[PDB]
Amino acid sequence: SEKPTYQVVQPINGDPFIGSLETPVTSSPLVAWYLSNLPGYRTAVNPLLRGIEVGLAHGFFLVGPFVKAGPLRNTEYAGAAGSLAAAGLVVILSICLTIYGISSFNEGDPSTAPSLTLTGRKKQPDQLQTADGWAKFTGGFFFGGISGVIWAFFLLYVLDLPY
Amino acid sequence: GHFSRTIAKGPDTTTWIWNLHADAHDFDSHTSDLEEISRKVFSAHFGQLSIIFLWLSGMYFHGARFSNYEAWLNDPTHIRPSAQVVWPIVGQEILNGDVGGGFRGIQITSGFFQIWRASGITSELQLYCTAIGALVFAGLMLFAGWFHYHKAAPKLAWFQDVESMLNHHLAGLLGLGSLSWARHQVHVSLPINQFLNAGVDPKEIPLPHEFILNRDLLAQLYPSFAEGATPFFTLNWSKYADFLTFRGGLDPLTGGLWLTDIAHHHLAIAILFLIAGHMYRTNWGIGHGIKDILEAHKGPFTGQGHKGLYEILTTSWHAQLSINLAMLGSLTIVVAQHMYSMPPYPYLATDYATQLSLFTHHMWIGGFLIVGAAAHAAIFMVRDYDPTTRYNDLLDRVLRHRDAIISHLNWVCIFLGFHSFGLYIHNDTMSALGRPQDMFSDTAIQLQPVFAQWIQNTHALAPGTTAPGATASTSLTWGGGDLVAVGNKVALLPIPLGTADFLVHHIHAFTIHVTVLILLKGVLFARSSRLIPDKANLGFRFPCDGPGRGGTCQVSAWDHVFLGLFWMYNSISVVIFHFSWKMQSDVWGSINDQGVVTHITGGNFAQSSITINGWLRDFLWAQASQVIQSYGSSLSAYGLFFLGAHFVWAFSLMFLFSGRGYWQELIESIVWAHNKLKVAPATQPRALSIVQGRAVGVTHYLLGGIATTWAFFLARIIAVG
Amino acid sequence: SHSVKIYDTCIGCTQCVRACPTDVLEMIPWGGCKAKQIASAPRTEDCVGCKRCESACPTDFLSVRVYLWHETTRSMGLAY
Amino acid sequence: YFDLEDIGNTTGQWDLYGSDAPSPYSPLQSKFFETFAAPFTKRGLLLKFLILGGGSTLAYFSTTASGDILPIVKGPQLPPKL
Amino acid sequence: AALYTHHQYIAGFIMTGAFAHGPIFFIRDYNPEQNADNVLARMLEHKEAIISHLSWASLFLGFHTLGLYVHND
Amino acid sequence: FMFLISWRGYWQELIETLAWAHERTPLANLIRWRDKPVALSIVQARLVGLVHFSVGYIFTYAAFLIASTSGKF
Amino acid sequence: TPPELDPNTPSPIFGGSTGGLLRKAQVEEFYVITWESPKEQIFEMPTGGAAIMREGPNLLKLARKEQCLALGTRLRSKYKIKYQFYRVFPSGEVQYLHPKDGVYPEKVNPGRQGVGVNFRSIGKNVSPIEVKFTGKQ
Amino acid sequence: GDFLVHHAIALGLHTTTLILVKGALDARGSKLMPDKKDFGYSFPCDGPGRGGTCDISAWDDFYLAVFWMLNTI
Ligand code: CLA
Ligand code: CLA
Ligand code: CLA
Ligand code: CLA
Ligand SMILES: CCCCCCCCCCCCCCCC(=O)OC[C@H](COP(=O)(O)OC[C@@H](O)CO)OC(=O)CCCCCCCCCCCCCCC
Ligand SMILES: CC1=C(C/C=C(\C)CCC[C@H](C)CCC[C@H](C)CCCC(C)C)C(=O)c2ccccc2C1=O
Ligand SMILES: CC1=C(C/C=C(\C)CCC[C@H](C)CCC[C@H](C)CCCC(C)C)C(=O)c2ccccc2C1=O
């Protein structure tokens, strides 16, 4: 399907009766390559390892907003301890993750994820889903989140750039 | 139903009466003959023009016989513009109040007085003639419609020649219209007003026609007129620059735009519309086929594009009506925001009562017309959309990814709503808990609109730099250190933009986006939906498709206009509120001998309009005191209409919160009481239709709501300004 | 799902069937009226409950009655 | 054109969008994480630990010097009629 | 002021409930035959009389109370 | 007022577009709902709207009855 | 009557939309509709716009059943076209509904079975009664 | 001043009772819906057929009266 199409908006994976379409945003090698990578995606890899990447990244990100816009912006006493706040959020966010994991049982008919790639290769399964898999992932997130939080505080609780 | 025979047939229920008016102008439902429709609407426009022409005649007539315009002319600073007088019956005469000039009348806000001074009108004699000339025209227009429907009605082929129509309308009407008015200015408006600004008095001004005949009187001022041959044919044009300039800004004595600029403006506009008039193809070769040019645009993204548009916009009125309504409304809005910032009339800006009501009037008219674009766009989809005969492809895709557009627009509104209204709920909570440092304010965490502040900055430094010919600024809100003060009133002043100004703009972003959402959702999903695959067969104006599927109420495109109608109210209603407070707080006021300026509310906008409680107290509760204390005075009617609107408004909630099933059952008991006493009408009483009850509801809601502010505003600025 | 019933007061005008968009009703041989037909409601599973059938019934009060009961995806009219 | 009762999956959007990636892995540093993230991988056990981790909130508020819990001092208003 | 306003709204809602369980009685528990031609069953057979006069009494009060007010303003 | 004026069929069609969205958004596909998102029922909305109307009705006057009286005593 | 059955047929030209099947089809049900056109015509297609009909067996897959009938009822009008649709399911299976009898529901047929016919006439229904059922049996 | 308001309250009582008893006496059915008895106290409606049947259940009549009750109190 390249490249004298001279048009953009190919029907989704050749199927024009499934709702969605193909656009550069939907499917561009740059986007696709980008989307294929990352912890949420990257099937066939340990869930716990993925949660850590995702968890670690988010925890680190959360500190900035809480510290800067916190009720003590604005205070030595609350110089960044508010990061504790960022941490609390990941404690709560790990609950929400844990309870959601109870929508997947241990029987478990593992994986509600599709069983095939596009190109209809027809091969493989995902495994993020399922009770055991999801739980590992949360635990990674919790671990990743608390850490990302502490590290970001670390640098700030020293800093020098930018004051 | 007069229009249709079966419709006319006979009346058996009262529903027939309501239907009769509801589909009175629904011309495309009376015939399938396009030519018959087009002939109908063309004549209808004549009948319209007659009414507005008659309307104008009464405005000029009343200005002549029932106004103190002459009295206002000599002393415009503290004479109140008043037309129309009230007969002394059942206590009415109290509405006749002190307006100055030894005259008893109701103060007006239409702004005709400012228009008439700009036109150089000096006597009731002149107003009297213009009234008659308007009536004479009204007689023509009405007659013209009768002649083009019963005597000589144009062919469908006549109306379809859009090219020829375009060329004329933006040249024959726009160009020559601008040119013709440009002539009156420099020959009548400019000379006479020049005298008026010299305090010569109207009766001591020579008659307008004496300026035209002999150059002598017009040449002593503006000495470029002295040359009989004129430097025009010399094509130097530099000599003319005395009567017309690019000075801009504002005359410090009359508070309006220099007529010295408006004449030059129209002179440019005229030929600019005269040249642009020579574009489309007709008969003598030279020109464009709009059909051809439209076809040329196509794209990797659009595939075929615009192909077939010319067919659609030449066989479907609702398609053309939507486009026109969308921009004519949009044009009315930019008119409101150009006349406030650049006062084009003598002693207009000084008259605060007129300015508030002018800006507010144009905002509603503009707001309504845009909503009407949504209706006819949806009507087009239901009645005129046929892919078999008139495919576009542009329309396609749009329909193809319609679930996408709405879903995204749905998100933006939620993002905007939170990031607008939420900030206020934040400030309201932080202030209540006793922590103003926390709030989004200029004194605390500030959110400066640096982008808008930057655009204004470049407008200030524009004259001389990026605008050499411009001696002064475009508008004094972009001035910098300038200040015009006509009378003891402030005409205009640089308007500041702070964090309080950042919030309110984001509320307008919001309200407009939601209004767009509701209306656009109704147009795209007018034919089909996952819920209702055959909505197009139910029509454009239908109540529902039953309680099935969990409930399918207001799935019609009509009802989307119905819901978006309240939101357009919610929208403007807060634009006009922004205008009112900001102008009163940071612009309008009195200037002293030293130069100290005291504003009406005293700059409380910046730190009190960031709170909801602040609008409810410092704005509503405060500025209401006028309307609610207007009893026993000349502004008595506003106090009553304020109460009267609050009623027609709460009266709408009766129709909006209920359904016709209750009412029909109630009527049953009432019909019984009638049948007992032989007083049962043969025309059986029926409740309003499901859709009518919504139509009745929103009208009264808009009326009571709009009307209620009308009395709000007009009582406020008159008593204060 | 929804519960629909037909009554012998019917006259077999077949308008309830033509109105239905999900095909819940059908006509049936009967000896009760001049048309000698009568409405039937075999496929209530596909019934959405919109009462389009009722708004086509000419009998003094409806011969076909829809009683909104338990909700299902089909009755809810969901496409997702 | 391509509907196959045989495979109901490709017929539907059963397929994972190419965003799936079933590729290799990431560095051996994982051997570390797998060791120390294990107690949080059990689920239910973690649900509890976090809720009882709400014992932190109690501890943090029972002891907190700089939150407005003091007047600091004033002489109170009477005030409309005392 | 609080106590009076309190109980009047409490009394208000309660009245709407007494008038709500009324219909529910008619729909779910009312046996027309067992109540043949008694005072209860006589209310349904001249219901159009009670409703219409309540309409009149409501229309009467509203037309004048509002009328007298607006006049005074 | 929202639940009393605007009615269901508009909201249900709006949610259907949001259901499509969630499905076609990466990094969010992994999560799915256990309950089908639907617009509130016709009767439910009349209730929910009446509850809002009644709560605000009481709370507003309660805020005014107390404060205005407490302030002056 | 013997259901005809559908095996493979070409789909009408269209190019895609966002109103198509989505997940429900994968896990619950989806409906397909078949009709034969004597000409490569153009039809509206619900949940979208403009698709070429094609000439031949013509096979289309939709959801909700109702979408199919809407198309089918438009297919019978405008163009003199016969049509049939089924409910696919997620694990093969062959459920054929409509016409079914092979003759349209609006047209009386010889052996259908009444199903839910009350010979009492409306207004003669009872009042509860705490027992099971509602009285409109 | 005490005269006009007492009539306003009398207006509030009568109208509210009008709405409530009408819902009660027509709970089992009217002429627009003779078999309302078969649908229960609370149902959405009976459809747009026969002119339209919005808010026809006895429940809705209550829901309409709650508004009038709040006005009266
Ligand atoms: C929606 C409007 C709004 C906004 C913007 C804020 C903002 C704020 N509030 Mg307020 N608040 C609001 C509404 C709002 N509030 C309402 C309605 C109430 C009524 C209860 C309150 C009551 C309230 C209280 C009592 C307090 C605040 C406080 C605050 C401040 C800190 C809060 C915080 O944790 O940081 C935010 C935490 C985050 C985790 C933010 C994450 C969001 C990020 C930025 C999203 C980024 C999007 C990104 C583009 C995604 C795509 C990127 C892509 C490239 C990958 C902050 C300025 C506190 C304060 O200011 O004390 C002085 C405080 O004590 N608020
Ligand atoms: C000179 C007298 C005259 C007479 C005897 C007629 C007679 C007739 N006309 Mg003609 N008409 C006239 C003048 C006249 N017309 C003029 C001057 C115009 C140009 C606007 C028209 C445009 C016109 C059209 C487009 C049509 C007719 C039609 C008809 C026929 C049906 C009448 C009708 O439409 O229903 C109703 C009669 C009315 C009087 C309706 C009222 C409309 C007026 C203009 C309202 C005035 C505006 C009002 C002031 C708005 C403010 C209201 C405010 C108080 C709230 C009838 C033979 C119709 C026809 O041929 O049937 C198929 C038709 O299509 N007329
Ligand atoms: C460009 C101007 C324009 C034109 C030529 C039309 C023309 C038409 N419209 Mg449209 N419309 C417009 C603007 C316009 N509209 C705008 C801006 C909106 C948004 C509000 C609408 C919303 C709209 C809807 C919802 C509908 C139409 C419909 C129609 C068609 C027939 C309806 C009819 O006969 O009117 C009938 C006239 C009445 C029923 C009178 C109603 C009473 C009015 C509203 C009260 C006004 C109050 C007054 C101003 C102040 C109080 C006075 C009082 C106290 C005395 C006709 C083709 C109908 C249609 O189906 O299209 C074919 C339709 O249902 N329009
Ligand atoms: C301010 C808004 C408002 C007003 C004025 C009314 C008024 C009325 N309601 Mg209503 N209601 C409302 C809001 C309102 N309601 C709301 C928000 C709801 C909740 C959805 C209800 C729910 C409701 C129910 C359930 C019932 C009513 C009923 C009634 C009628 C009671 C009869 C009566 O006392 O006096 C008579 C009429 C009036 C006092 C007002 C008439 C308006 C003026 C006075 C008429 C004069 C017109 C004047 C000449 C202006 C002409 C205009 C010009 C353009 C021609 C009365 C018409 C009941 C009823 O219908 O009883 C018969 C009833 O069943 N209401
Ligand atoms: C951070 C500050 C920097 C600003 C950048 C970000 C702000 C602007 C937002 C980027 C939008 C991208 C526009 C690309 C320019 C553009 O529109 O390209 C137009 C592109 C061109 O198509 P063609 O080349 O085929 O056009 C010719 C033929 O198609 C027509 O004959 O068409 C499409 O993109 C189709 C899909 C619509 C795309 C929808 C995106 C709409 C964005 C909605 C936001 C509107 C914002 C308006 C604000 C005033
Ligand atoms: C009050 C109300 C009614 C009843 C209101 C009606 C029927 C208004 C129409 C009544 C008019 C005013 C009576 C017409 C009287 C004639 C004009 C005769 C008058 C004779 C002289 C007085 C001039 C509905 O039908 C309805 C339907 C759907 C949602 C809400 C409501 C709703 O709220
Ligand atoms: C907004 C709106 C919706 C959409 C409303 C939805 C989807 C309700 C969902 C609300 C979300 C979940 C947030 C609500 C949170 C509440 C505070 C619930 C608290 C939890 C318990 C107390 C129940 C309708 O479905 C509707 C139907 C008929 C008429 C009008 C409307 C209407 O106006």
Coordinates of N, CA and C in Angstrom, one line a residue, chain B residues 171 189 399:
Chain B
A171 N -20.0 45.2 -5.2 CA -19.5 46.3 -6.0 C -20.6 47.4 -6.2
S189 N -21.3 66.3 5.5 CA -20.9 66.0 6.9 C -19.7 66.7 7.4
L399 N -18.5 13.3 7.9 CA -19.5 12.4 8.4 C -18.8 11.1 8.8

